Every structure is written in structure tokens, then in C-alpha cells.
Amino acid sequence: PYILVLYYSRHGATAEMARQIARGVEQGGFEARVRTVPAVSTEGALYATLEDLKNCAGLALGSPTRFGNMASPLKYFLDGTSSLWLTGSLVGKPAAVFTSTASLHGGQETTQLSMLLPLLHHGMLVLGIPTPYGASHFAGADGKRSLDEHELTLCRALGKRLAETAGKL
Amino acid sequence: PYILVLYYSRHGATAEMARQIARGVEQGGFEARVRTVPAVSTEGALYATLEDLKNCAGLALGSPTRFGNMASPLKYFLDGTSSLWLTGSLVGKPAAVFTSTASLHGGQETTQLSMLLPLLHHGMLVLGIPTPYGASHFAGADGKRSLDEHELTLCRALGKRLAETAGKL
Amino acid sequence: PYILVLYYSRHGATAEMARQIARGVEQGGFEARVRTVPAVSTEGALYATLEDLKNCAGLALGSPTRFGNMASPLKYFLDGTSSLWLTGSLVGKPAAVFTSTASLHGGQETTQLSMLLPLLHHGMLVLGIPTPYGASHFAGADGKRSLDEHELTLCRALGKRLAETAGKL
Amino acid sequence: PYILVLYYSRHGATAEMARQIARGVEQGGFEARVRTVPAVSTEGALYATLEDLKNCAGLALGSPTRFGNMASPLKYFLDGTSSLWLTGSLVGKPAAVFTSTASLHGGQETTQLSMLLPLLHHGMLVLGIPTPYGASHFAGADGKRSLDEHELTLCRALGKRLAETAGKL
């Protein structure tokens, strides 16, 4: 009976968003299981496992926007979920996304969008904020800037909405 | 207690897909209300109304792929739904998409994708087929080619899944 | 030897962006031919023609964001360009997009994105701003708010870049 | 005076597509520099370097479709190109994409699409096939199935078109 809040964070912006979403989830009648993934190479929160994904009632996926796509260490953990898609899990379970960007120009909607693609592959029901595809944060080219009362509200709103939908389902 | 199957059709390909989805919906424990929209200019099934959208338990949206986007007469009917977004309806209700293309090259996924965008704006919960974003049909450059046993299965599957989710919700 | 700046405007926000882009185009060594399209129904700048599109050296496409997609009257004019895609024109010619939104939440990137899809169908070379997919404007829920020195800079930058690329090509 | 054909391959499908594109590039008046990237973890062609990307006249990017996104080892190599975006390179240079999928359902257009996002971030001019966003290959759930005369034609066509555009630029 938990929503998995699964994310990756480089300079900790996506990490705080994760926590707030978790609060939302709790407010929504569910236990938040907040997890991350390890760095990758060719040469914090606890690390997520396949079984974490297999057993969640629903999922919130987070990454910093990295050139319009999700961060590779997260992509790496998902690339290792064939089994779960093949036996058709995550199917039926609700999901949402969230992102952080260190950039004025843009790139969050599209990244949120690119992260809903796989969830729709795993056959999940995707929901947003009524950005509209998911919770977003501007971090400022310092990576420094902190959430606002507004961004905090949106994170919990989404977390709460995700949990309530898993409930209603 | 009905799923609105809302679509536009030029040469009737999307129209047959609509019907099959409707069958799915019935199989799924719901009444299908199948509707279309009128042609637009500067100079079949019954026509949809705003109240049709306001009162549905859930929604299936269909168009032929027209240069990677949905057909304008459909876009025109949606552009007239501000009121519904403003008072935040459709929110919470499930939705799916479907498309027809007269083309080898491609363009269906992207069009399905571009049609899920607005549903996520109106705050809906979007579901696919576990293409993966929605039911698709190749019509062949004649516009002629008919559904297969396979494409028919997918249409009802989606319709049934949409209705069952509205149910579970 | 002209770049077609083709757009639709409801409350004139996209219209001013069009003009500025046109200035950019001129700065870039090209004549701007600024055109719009007429309203559509079931029951300003000059109107664009098919031949306007056939003969341009390059293209800038503009719309207000309407539920994550381009405005229907524009979609309607493009839907009438089969001939041009079929005989494979626009192919090789550069193109860019621009948008206006009356909304805080979001929706511009995705709309810009959904408008680059067709250009890639017609086989065009698409370029952005080095949002990153094209020039954007927040209009404020009044539709009232005017361009900034910043948004103005971006519009001409894009127009200038589009024209220069058509040049280099 | 070379087009960088940059790709990742798991079971060698994207690898053959790379080679064919390279042939295209040669036919188009350019030297193909075909490169890949190493596997990533938490615990063939030569490997690409940052300087390979810095000095190309243009770029073709390839991956297998991995849940609607590009493969993580490729994403990892791109995530290490901040410097190049920051000093605004790749800007002005043409680019294309290509993909392989082991799947009936779908996912190639969207993945091609998700790979054009970053290229548009790095400020590149993106071109397709006049799928329409780039060259695609069905590998069959064996990963086994080989290119067709048709898919081969498309790969070289794209490679040739990419090189010719870099030429014209």
C-alpha cells in the first residue's frame, strides 16, 4: 500500500521535490516509499530495486531535465525492467512525473513528456496537474534556487492526487 | 454512465474504429455514446455537444492523422471547450486515443501523442494499450483498406479498458 | 526570395510576434511575407495562399497554444496542403515555430513541438533558438500582456536565423 | 569534413543501420566517421569522444528504442556534453536520427522524436526522410531480423541527405 517516488538527483533539486511529493502521497491516504538510483559510468535516499517497482500501488518518476530527456542513471534503472513490462506489470497502476531544470530557455514540458512515454509503454495510467504534465522546478544556473511555496504546493498536490487515484483504483 | 467516443472521419476509417471501441465500452460495463463533429470551412453519427463532454464518465478521442496532428474539425470542437477546462471538468475522468493513417512512412504515434496533450490539459487520466499510446489503423493510400481481426481486437480492448477504468474510478 | 511568416492570431499576441520575426527576416537578408488565415466555422494581415507556401525560401509558423496544439484555423489551412506534400515541396527549405499562451501552468514547448511535426512531414529542416524549439510569449490571462525587450529580441533572432539559413542553403 | 554517425547498439541492429547511413554520407560528398559508446553500469566500432562531436560537420544519432527513449549508454555520453552546449557548438550543424525496435506494438517515432529534442537544445538543424522523423528498423522479438532492401535504401538516403545539407551549409 505504497506509492513509489522514484527519482534521480545531481545537485539535490529533484530530491527535495521527491520528499514533498511523498508528503502529498501521505496526505492522500498512502505510504510514500521514496527511492533513488546509483550513478552510472563506463569506468541520500535508499536505492530502488526491481521489487520496489513490482509492488507499488502507483509511481511518481523524477529527474533533472538533461537535454530534453531524463537523466541517464534513471534511464539505466528503467532499461533494467524488461521483466516487469514483459509480464505486464505496472499495468493499471497510476503514475506521474516531475522535473527540475537549471535553465531559463526551457525543456521541462518536453522532458516530462518524454518520461510519460515509458509509463504508457509499461501500460500505466498517467495523470498530471489539473506545467500540466507534471510538477516542475526552476533551479537557476547555480543549481541553487529552492522551492517556492507555489512549487511545494504543486508537488504535494500531485503526490496527493496520485495516491488518491491509486486509492480510487 | 456512458463513455463518449468522440471522433472525426474523412473517408470513414476512423468511423469504423469508433464503432468497435463502442463495442469494447459495452463489453466493459458502460454505454457507448458515439459522436462526431461537423466539417469546418472559411467559406454518419450524430454531432457532439459540449454537454456530451461535460457528462461522460470517460472519453475516447479519434481522428485521422493529418500531418502529425489531429484533424482540424475535431480541433475546432475542442477549441470550443474553454468553459469545461476553466471550471475544471473532464478532470479525474479516464481517456484514450485512436487514429487512422493513409500512409506507409508513419505519423500515428506522434498524432496519438499530440492528442493526449489536451486531455492532460483538461486534467484527464490517460491510458493506452498495455501502438502503445492508442489504437491505430493503416488505411492504405486508397483510404480503402479495412480493419483486420487484429485492429478490431485492439479497438474493443481499448474501449473495454477505458470503460473498466471509469468503472474502477 | 522571401520567408513566409505564416500565423494565426485570436487576440493579436501571435500577430505582433509575427511582425518582429519579419524584422528578423529582413535583418537576415530576406523579404518577409507576413500572412494569416481566416477563421473557420461549421456555421489584420493578408490571407495566405497555397502559392505563398509553394514559393517561399523558408517558413515561420505561428499560433496561440490551444490545449497543447496549434489553433484550428491554422490547422485547417495546412490540412489543405496535400498537393504540396505529395509533389514533395517545402522539402529542403528551413522552418521555425512560434507561439503565444495566456497561461501560467504551461503548454508552449509541447505546442511548438506539435507544430514541428508537420514541417518534418513536409520534409523541412527545422531550427530553433540556440524556449529552445522556438520563440514563445506569455500573454497573461487577460490576453493583454505585451512583448518584452527580451521576447522581441528572440523573435527577430529566430527570424534572422531562419533567413540566414535559407541564405546559406 | 566528416559526418559523425553516433550510435549505441545492444544486439547489433542499430550498428548495421549506422554503416549504411555512413555509405549514404559518402555518396553525399562527405567522410563518415562511425562511432559508438561504451556500456554503462553502477557496478565493434571505435568509441566516440567529445572532440569527435566538436569537429563534425553534422551528426546522425542512433539507438535502439528503449521504452520510448534512447538507450542509457548513449544518453550518458550526451549528458557529458555540457561544455559543447555551453560554448554553443553543434549550433548550425545538421542532424538526423535513427532507431531500431524489437517490437510490433510501436515506439520508434516517439523515440526518434525524443532524440531530436536534445539536438534542438544543442541548436542543430534537424532533418528527416521526405518514419518521417528518421530511419527506422523492426528487429523482431528475436532481435534477429535483418535490414530490407527498403530499410537499407532509407538509411543511405538519410545519410546522403544529411551530408548534402552539411555541404549546402
* Shape-level CATH architecture of chain A: 3-Layer(aba) Sandwich
Rg measurement of chain A, Å? 14 Å
CATH homologous superfamily designation of chain A: Flavodoxin domain
How would you classify the quaternary structure? homotetramer
End-to-end span of chain A in angstroms?
Answer: 12 Å
Q: Main beta sheet of chain A, described?
A: 6 strands, parallel
Mass-distribution shape of chain A:
globular
InterPro entries (chains A, B, C, D): Flavodoxin/NO_synth, Flavodoxin_CS, Flavoprotein-like_sf, Flavoprotein_WrbA-like, FMN_Rdtase-like_dom
Pfam family, one (chains A, B, C, D): FMN_red
Enzyme class (chains A, B, C, D): oxidoreductase
EC number (chains A, B, C, D): 1.6.5.2
Which helices and strands appear, and what pairs or packs with what?
The structure is a homotetramer of 169-residue chains.
Chain A: E1 2-7, H1 13-27, E2 31-36, H2 50-55, E3 58-64, H3 72-79, H4 82-86, E4 94-101, H5 108-121, E5 125-126, E6 134-138, H6 149-168
Parallel strand pairs in A: 1-2, 1-3, 3-4, 4-5, 4-6
Helix pairs in contact in A: 1-6
Subunit structure (chains A, B, C, D): Homodimer.
Protein name (chains A, B, C, D): NAD(P)H dehydrogenase (quinone)
Enzyme class (chains A, B, C, D): oxidoreductase
